[PDB]
Symmetry: C2
Subunit: 85 residues, 2 copies
């Protein structure tokens, strides 16, 4: 099966579908993303840089914002984002 | 776009993509259901009954479990499920 799902075309995060190790390369939307941390199954990782204060877009919706600068390929979770739904 | 997304074929929840009113009839992945509470954009609702203790399945993964019996078309959130990812 797929290692990740990118739920919606506008999303700047994808969800890991397996426990993915730091340094793993993923092919998403005709580009490559390299994980910068371990990302547990079900957790988000960044498809692009998400600057501090910038929206996390998931399901095509702004679901929250970054609490600090997040780099493409980093683990996105409670530590570095706030969810606003 | 749609008013909801069922992300994976195994999921027993869908994600509202707009603020859906109590009463709305939903059709997805050949499945129908009628909403029993308002469901805010970005929030989950049950596609089928989910018994107390039973997994919430989202992204094709077990992401958590029900704290109480959940009826098809109910709002699924912190009040009636726990997330274990």
């Amino acid at each position: 099966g797929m290692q990740y799902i990118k739920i919606h075309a506008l999303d700047n995060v994808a969800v890991a579908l397996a426990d993915l190790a730091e340094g793993t390369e993923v092919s998403v939307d005709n580009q490559t993303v390299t994980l910068r941390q371990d990302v547990a199954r079900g957790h988000k990782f960044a498809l692009t840089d998400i600057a501090k204060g910038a929206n996390v877009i998931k399901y095509g919706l702004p679901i929250g914002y970054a609490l600090a600068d997040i780099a493409a390929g980093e683990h996105v979770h409670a530590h570095n984002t706030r969810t606003n739904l």
